[PDB]
Ligand binder design. Structure first.
Ligand SMILES: Nc1ncnc2c1ncn2[C@@H]1O[C@H](CSCC[C@H](N)C(=O)O)[C@@H](O)[C@H]1O
Length: 260
């Protein structure tokens, strides 16, 4: 019952009302045991935990997605590609992490896909608002975009955006530390996610990379001794598994293209 109680408080009007029930329950269980059974403290622990992995990237209250979609529609309707891209850039900027890549979006994907095969199915885990980029990805017309994150409204908005861009897609609310990763996908994107997973569960980072059913994985780390920290640990861990990888650095992002 104590977990249900915590969750009820975590339906946290504003910030965490639509976070994946699976994520709330996982955090609440760890928080309860760590809080010595004190629900009030368990609630604070969970809330704080949610801010670390989710809340920190988004607004104090849910973003105004309706307005973001409205602008998207006007552009798509007016058949103005410039307007569509402008509306997409504006939307993606609501998510703090995704916002950091916008200045290097074209270089980022132009280069990234030169090191990848032409995908039939692109999976974007802990996607943030990244899927809204794509017109920049030069994806094959038939490519199916599979995106997921930890918030239903964010993911639900990613779905509407992809629908307006007429991009074949499927979207789900999935927690990388529990949900399945066996669905086949030619390429999987794990952009600026590992650090967050490691914080939630030590070692989870590479456990995900290993089980993800994709022969091609792109793992990135934010750069803004952050580059040193991330490049050293990841690279030692890779050479420790004889993983074939190609390193790149675009904008404030350290990129690793993993094959097999
Ligand atoms: N356990 C978990 N499972 C899936 N996504 C998670 C997660 N914990 C955190 N996230 C998500 O991790 C993302 C990190 S920020 C990076 C967002 C996006 N990948 C981009 O590159 O721009 C957030 O969107 C957050 O909601």
């Amino acid at each position: 019952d104590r977990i249900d109680e915590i969750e009820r408080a975590i339906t946290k009007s504003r910030r965490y009302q639509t976070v994946a029930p699976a994520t709330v329950r996982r955090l609440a269980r760890a928080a309860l045991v760590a809080a010595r059974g004190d629900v009030p403290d368990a609630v604070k622990r969970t809330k704080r935990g949610l801010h670390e992995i989710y809340g920190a990237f988004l607004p104090p209250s849910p973003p105004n997605y309706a307005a973001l979609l409205r602008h998207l529609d006007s552009a798509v309707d007016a058949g103005d590609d410039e307007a569509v891209r402008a509306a997409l850039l504006r939307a993606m900027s609501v998510h703090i992490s995704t916002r950091e890549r916008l200045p290097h979006l074209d270089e980022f994907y132009r280069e990234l896909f030169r090191h990848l095969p032409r995908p039939n199915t692109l999976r974007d885990l802990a996607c943030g608002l990244n899927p809204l980029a794509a017109p920049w990805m030069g994806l094959p017309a038939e490519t199916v975009y599979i995106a997921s994150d930890i918030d239903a409204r964010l993911v639900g908005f990613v779905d509407e955006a992809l629908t307006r861009l007429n991009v074949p897609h499927r979207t789900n609310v999935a927690d990388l530390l529990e949900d399945r990763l066996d669905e086949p996908a030619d390429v999987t994107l794990l952009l600026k996610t590992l650090p967050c997973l490691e914080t939630q569960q030590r070692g989870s980072g590479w456990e995900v990379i290993d089980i993800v059913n994709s022969p091609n994985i792109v793992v990135t780390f934010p750069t803004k001794g952050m580059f040193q920290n991330y490049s050293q640990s990841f690279e030692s861990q890779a050479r420790e598994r004889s993983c074939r990888i190609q390193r790149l650095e675009i904008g404030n992002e350290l990129i690793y293209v993993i094959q097999k």
